[PDB]
Amino acid sequence: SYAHLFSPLGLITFLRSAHVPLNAEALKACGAKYAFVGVPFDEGNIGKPGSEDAPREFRLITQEYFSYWFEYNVDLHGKAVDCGDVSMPKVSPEVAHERIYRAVREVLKSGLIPIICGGDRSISITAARALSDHIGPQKKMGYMHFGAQLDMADSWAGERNLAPCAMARITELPNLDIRNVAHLGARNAMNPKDHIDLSKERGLQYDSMFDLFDAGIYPLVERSIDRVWSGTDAQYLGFNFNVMDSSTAPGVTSTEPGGLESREMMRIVDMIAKRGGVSVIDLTELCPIFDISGTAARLAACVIMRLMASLAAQDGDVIDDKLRRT
Amino acid sequence: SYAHLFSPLGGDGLITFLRSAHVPLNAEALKACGAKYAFVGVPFDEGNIGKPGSEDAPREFRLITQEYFSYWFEYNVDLHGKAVDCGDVSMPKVSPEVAHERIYRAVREVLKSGLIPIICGGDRSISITAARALSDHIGPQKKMGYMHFGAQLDMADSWAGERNLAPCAMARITELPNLDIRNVAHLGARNAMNPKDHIDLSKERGLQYDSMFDLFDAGIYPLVERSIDRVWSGTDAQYLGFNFNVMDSSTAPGVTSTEPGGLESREMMRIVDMIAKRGGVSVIDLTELCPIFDISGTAARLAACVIMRLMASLAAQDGDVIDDKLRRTDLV
Amino acid sequence: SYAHLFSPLGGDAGDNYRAPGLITFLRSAHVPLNAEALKACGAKYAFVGVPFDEGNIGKPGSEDAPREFRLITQEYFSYWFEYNVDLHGKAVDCGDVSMPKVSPEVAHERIYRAVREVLKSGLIPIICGGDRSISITAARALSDHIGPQKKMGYMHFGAQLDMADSWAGERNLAPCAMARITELPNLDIRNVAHLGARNAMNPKDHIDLSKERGLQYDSMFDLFDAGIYPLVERSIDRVWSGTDAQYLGFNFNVMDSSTAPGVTSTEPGGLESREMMRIVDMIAKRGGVSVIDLTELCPIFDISGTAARLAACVIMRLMASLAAQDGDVIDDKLRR
Amino acid sequence: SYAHLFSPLGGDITFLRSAHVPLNAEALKACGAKYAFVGVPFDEGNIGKPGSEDAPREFRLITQEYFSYWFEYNVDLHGKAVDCGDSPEVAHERIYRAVREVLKSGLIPIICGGDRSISITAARALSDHIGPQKKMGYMHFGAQLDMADSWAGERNLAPCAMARITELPNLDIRNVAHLGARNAMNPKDHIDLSKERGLQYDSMFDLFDAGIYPLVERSIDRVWSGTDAQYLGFNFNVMDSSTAPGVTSTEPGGLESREMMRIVDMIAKRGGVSVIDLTELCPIFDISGTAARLAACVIMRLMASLAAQDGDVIDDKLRRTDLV
Amino acid sequence: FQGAMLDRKTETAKWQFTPHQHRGPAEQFGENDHIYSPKLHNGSFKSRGLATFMGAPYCPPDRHKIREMGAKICFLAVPWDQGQIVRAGASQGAAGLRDATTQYFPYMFEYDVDLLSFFRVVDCGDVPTVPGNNIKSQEYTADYVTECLEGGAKVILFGGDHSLPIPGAKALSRFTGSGKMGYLHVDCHLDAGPDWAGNLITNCSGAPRALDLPNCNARNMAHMGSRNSLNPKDWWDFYVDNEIRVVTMPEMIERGLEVCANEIFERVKKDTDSLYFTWDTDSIDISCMPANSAPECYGLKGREVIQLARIAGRHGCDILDIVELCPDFDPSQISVKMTVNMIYHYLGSRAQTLRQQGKQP
Amino acid sequence: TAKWQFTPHQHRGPAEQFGENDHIYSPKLHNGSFKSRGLATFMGAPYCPPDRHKIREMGAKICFLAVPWDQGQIVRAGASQGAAGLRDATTQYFPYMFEYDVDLLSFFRVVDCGDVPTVPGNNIKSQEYTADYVTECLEGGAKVILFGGDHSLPIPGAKALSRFTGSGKMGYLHVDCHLDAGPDWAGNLITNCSGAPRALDLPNCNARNMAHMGSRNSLNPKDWWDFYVDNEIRVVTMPEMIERGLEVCANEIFERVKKDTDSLYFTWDTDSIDISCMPANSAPECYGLKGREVIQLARIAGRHGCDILDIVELCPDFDPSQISVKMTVNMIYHYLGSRAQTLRQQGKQP
Ligand SMILES: [Ca+2]
Ligand code: NI
Ligand code: NI
Ligand code: NI
Ligand code: NI
């Protein structure tokens, strides 16, 4: 019952959790708070290939961990379920995105928090739209994304829903006020001038990595947290782990030097969790073929699990300190 | 001869730690050889419940140390002749009780000589036997200190019905009769490989471990200095052990169980100088290196630099420096 | 003692501690590079590592071949049931030749003296290289060792002719190797064989020079047309008949890329593993060889050690096949 | 539904994506399948490099890269198999009963992963299942004889397998075949013991000299003629290293892939087999899944070839334009 | 009119290359230096520098520029790998291919041919892609291939995925006009899905799309190399229903490569004016070609790949395409260098045949 | 007569783009080379032969020149593959840097001058080629980015800058985990561990304008340290950089090496960078610069400016990721971005 908290007496799923189908009734009844949804889709990727294999590698990494986090006095066992991968045809991106949209809507309908582990960054477009529709036109949405790239291409090669377009599409959602949008970590030269122009035209208040360094990081992060969470009914949190310094995130689609180090992101996770809630969590652009001994996948897995544990600690959902190995 | 300090001149095999001489594992031979440290390889992994690989760590560690000179310009110290290599303890492969006995005799024999064993292991359970050997070596009238770096507390009273596997190490080590808990330091614990009974047992015994969170919040060095003082003040012997998963995964991938959010290499180097300021240590171990997972030998290279810098910094603190007026033109 | 022929007995103790040792060819004993200590050790072969790659005009990596080659050979038992031969004690390892970096003239002299010393002992040097140019020096050492009144034979397996009279203006780089070796004064071109040449790393001047000198190389296309073994047998006969010493050299890019991926310059459409094994047996029927070399193994390109393992089996089966031909077999009646 | 035979139409983890049926003899007999895949991730008999522990999982995943339809045979493997995938002492007894229960159902167990010592227990379970009044045959492919009477003082490790399997009372030595032995992983006591017992092994050298197939044909006949049940085991280090890197102990100078496929058809001519095993796959050493892909294609081709031999083919007139 | 204002009709292209690449003070200038050991330096045998395919001149894919250079072979990379039903990766093939040509001379002693000057090879660069848009990316490929054909050259097309023969054969069919076109498909996989999840133009439909062309007839089509069960029934039904000859790998092995290949080349060329030859790398055994999206055992061996390339060269084709190479899956060079030799032996055998007939390319 | 011409987003043919500034914007007709590198030069810049007359006709103010020579190397080969990894890594970026608002390509009229040829086995002749080639870039009126190859590169590199500086004075900055100051290595004066003594030998390079930054650990024989003590050349070890702060240290050092000089040679070994960020080295080392510090040092260098920047010892075959090659791209890009931002602030041209 609680034996998994202690030293042992002697499908591939996220955290070795149970599989529940993508069905709202089964999800509400299963008792979990999060629903892991794999999206092995990479046909919005304009860069090097590889992110299609991220959901499997991410899952395999998470099966190595215990569920109890002594730093938070929190047990993750039973807090998540795994709904498998969204079923999507190849060479038909429109249908694939509709499948993603219906999968995210079904999770949101159940009341659980989807954890969307992607192939490419364009899946965030559809996931964010699904949340925007889920809460409806009478609600306010917030959106915070971590990444080295603004992804503010109004169009790219004449197309409108590729990975470098994601933020340009997401900031057009009707119940997402731009003042409730945060983007943290932009740096280096994979940011063409029209992305900056479009950001200025729309009032996108991105926190560049340089901006973050100058402020000591955390005071500026706290201010953007406040913009995303104050006065909004739902919050979307997304990660491209090329926001991290290349040394701790080599296995990503477009790795970037001069970013966040692991202890800094762990602090940011705790700052986010103080708001006591999040509506969707995504992670995209992990690229196992470029990884170094699974370093990027393991960093990603550690951030997601600490985020779950930190939210539970904030909610008071900790375990009884009096439990003993019995 | 001083030619090993300098670039080779023109016209001019054994795999050992720092290209140092081999001396048999014999107390009499070790005392007479003149070294201060005796490196002992212990390729034993049958206390390991995680991914395999630490069995090959001693050889890869030895090979990495041969990429470096013995001279440390930062300290004006020459490590040449300061260590010797005693080879490996013979691992019979199916008698953990017997293997630990051979390890116990090996450490007692090195300690009897007065040299400092540098014990390079397979899995962390090797520390149980080495720490017991030191405790028995100093006897019940002496005080022992103990410091370990690692992401895991290893405070399982029992694990899968066993009492001496790697996750049980600290639970056994803190039972030693001449190791007061106030002289015990554990630095770096973090993340989810620390079940509740490891924390419950640590609280029951008063183990004031310095978690990674504790370290970061204190700026690292002020808290490390306090734990150094607890381990070295008033003790007759000190045991220093490393699991290099104390380091951030980015800088030590080749370890048995890598963990994000750990020490930077520059932080471990300063800590090494802080330890060396106390001017002595009785036993040094490093366990859980896992070369099959390493990239460009990163973890092995980091471990070698930490250990050799410790030797160099101890020599500098001791004033055991070389004649800095020496020049390469003196060889000709 | 013969327990090494049989399944390990296990349950054995008393070793207590293992002295630090050296990674050695075939887990064999280390003997210094000294002719008398070599003559007295009882072995027939002396493995010599040559981690030298400053004659390489292609992708880097062969510097690490001697280490990876040795490590592969340490996985195998010494008894070969196909030949009833025990390789234990038949070889020793002399370590690597000591060579300075960025000083190829000195490096080659160190190689020359090393091969001369092993030959002086009467043992067969097995020279595991970095790059192909080390064969120039090794073959010259054999030519000097036998002297001007004796006849030398030379056979090389490789995808490349290496008949550059000069390359980038230089005369002793890897692609020049055969052009230098075919200049040796006691090596008649009629006693020279080169087998396996194929594909486009063979510029026209290598072909012109070969024709100018009468080098009858057996191209891979020639071998296929002949069913391979009939043509190999004739070149074996040219190299061994009427010669006092024979030099046998391998660039394992002679092998099909599928079975030698980890080489400096891998080549499709070559020999398969079972074919090289028959060729090895054909060679051993001549009952002797003076020098064996292998160069241009490239571990950074290998796939699960495939090329290094192929080379190891070729070399060990050659020793085993020579021993069987010599009658140096094991007593069948030996039991555990 | 037959839709699985064709390219998916627009709109809209087990071996071969087959259904799971519990490891229970009655449930297996009623499910309608002919094979029961059993993963056995056991590596406590392995004396070499580790990795065979993960073989059952990677084998399953590789088979999901293929369709169930074999155009070379007009055979559909869909529904012919189901998946039953799962302290050395009790584990071997658990393996024994797992094989006994599948055999009790009448299905053909396909025993995957783990080190070669598992064949000892599966062969013992089959020998007990048929009883003392029937004759058993055994065929194994591998580079190693595994004829150690004992190894490091043990008697049930991987190098002891053939010494144990050939002691079964209903295994006449003339009904035993071992194909592919070569190179130096064969100590003399393994050869001497083979001579003592009359093990008529076909070394790789013997196979090449005979053109392979004439010799394979004779050993097949020795295993299948006059026997009531036949056990077939694969260590894919029988294959040339170039085509099977991801194995425990790879060896150069072995069978090409095209030669094995032809051998598979030769075995399939006999119209039946009692147990199929594969051991010593080692995925951590694999590149592009080469060993796992070869193993998958051999086992599935054997199933497809057996179905074609039995006449168990599909209606070749079915077309994709029939799906509703 | 933007086209006219931007183009330079009166600036003529020159076919010019430096033997062994490097210019500057140590540039070599000998007319034939590229077929001999390098003289002043190492060329690009160790360090790739700015290498084109074979070191050939770059020529923009422009019919007038190609004809001005007199190029008779265009190398054109088509890295598009998002018409792919298996997995991405073939977008990296062309870079590994070009880099691997630095490991060779453009001279083949097995045929005594200088490939570069015999054909006046040019490297036409890469076809651009529109990510996520298979339809538009294939429209680009056909228009680029059309420029090479209209420039008077025969074409080596180097892929990403096997959607390539769809625009490839479309361009050749259009160029062939009222003449007849043959189509040869060499592959482990039958690649004859009528559609894949409703999509007609993925990398599993090259053969049906070719048969749809107005001047490509079933009697001039053929497939070689198939085996194993990544072959849904409808792919095999296509060949049965349309009477298109399939030579499976078991048949090639039993009858002999030379006999089968010569018969097939006679069939696909009988009464045709042109031939499209598409060659998937997974036809090659996985032991020789691990770097593929769908690598397969029971395939061509290394020496047989070169044999088939030679035989193709004896007969000749107007477009040769080679697809699905994924160099990132291979820690060795075996796969990229296999693809170099497919092209080099094809061209070497083609030149030897033309010269033997007293014909020019 | 040479013309400086490039196609935005590389590809010509029917879908070629022609906008004068298209290279700083999201591609319009296609994906450019972000996925498939095609025929990529450094930064997509025009190729220009290392020829003073062509370079000057193009008006190029920055020449990228690869020096892949890796056989003057005392550790292990591999750096001959660096320049290819670098060029390929620049396809992952635009030539526009939003952190500086600079179009690097048109600001400097960057050209790619190809590779310096090598003579395998002949360190003397290969270094002579490097000096001859570097000289053509300098005489063409350009400042130079030299990409190694092993750290023998500053020997011919600084000789060419020294000759070009004539009667003026040259400074020399060496950033490295290793002191690289062997008087000789096994009798050889010009291996990759002698950049600094060979620079001090130059008639117009004085000790007071020389400096070394980044050293630590024990791949540093005593004669390498004795060189700096005996000639009074300031060394700033990595521990000092950490204790005092990179900016303070770097600014002090750039002031020293530039004081009263007419030109500056800046050689930067990638193993100054911590092994966690830079595994692709012949001799990768812990206790080095962190990723954000590398970019900081490149910006600081760009503020002060140098005549030749060289970056050596990158071995991409040792790295399964792109982190090492992309680190070297950012070293160069942030140098140039900061240099351009400074020039534009000063009202000066490159
Ligand atoms: Ca015009
Ligand atoms: Ni295909
Ligand atoms: Ni295919
Ligand atoms: Ni340096
Ligand atoms: Ni350095």
Numbering used by the authors:
A (entry chain A): 6 to 15, 27 to 342
B (entry chain D): 6 to 17, 26 to 345
C (entry chain C): 6 to 341
D (entry chain F): 6 to 17, 28 to 101, 108 to 345
E (entry chain E): -3 to 357
F (entry chain B): 8 to 357
Q: How did the manuscript describe this experimental structure?
A:
Here we show that these genes encode a Ni2+-dependent enzyme that efficiently and specifically hydrolyzes metformin to guanylurea and dimethylamine. The active enzyme is a heteromeric complex of α- and β- subunits in which only the α-subunits contain the conserved His and Asp residues for the coordination of two Ni2+ ions in the active site. A crystal structure of metformin hydrolase reveals an α2β4 stoichiometry of the hexameric complex, which is unprecedented in the ureohydrolase family. Our findings establish the molecular basis for metformin hydrolysis to guanylurea as the primary pathway for metformin biodegradation and provide insight into the recent evolution of ureohydrolase family proteins in response to an anthropogenic compound.
For crystallization, we used AnMefH as it shares a higher sequence identity with DmgH than PmMefH (93.5% and 93.3% sequence identity for the alpha subunits, respectively), so that residues responsible for the change in substrate specificity are easier to identify. The best diffraction data was obtained from AnMefH crystals that were soaked with urea prior to vitrification and X-ray analysis. In the obtained structure, both MefHα and MefHβ adopt an almost identical three-layer alpha-beta-alpha fold typical for members of the ureohydrolase family, but diverge notably at the N-terminal loop regions that are distinct to each subunit type. The global structure of MefH is distinct amongst ureohydrolase family proteins since it is a heterohexamer consisting of a dimer of heterotrimers, each with αβ2 stoichiometry. The MefHα subunits are located in apical position and make a close contact between both trimers. In contrast, the MefHβ subunits interact weakly with their counterparts in the opposite trimer. Each MefHα subunit coordinates two metal ions in its active site through four Asp (D183, D187, D276 and D278) and two His (H158 and H185) residues. The electron density in the active site is best explained by two Ni2+ ions, which is in agreement with the ICP-OES experiments and the metal dependency of the enzyme. In the crystal structure, the Ni2+ ions coordinate a molecule of urea. In contrast, the corresponding region of the MefHβ subunits do not contain any metal ions or ligands, and four of the six residues that bind Ni2+ in the MefHα subunits are replaced by amino acids that are not prone to coordinate cations.
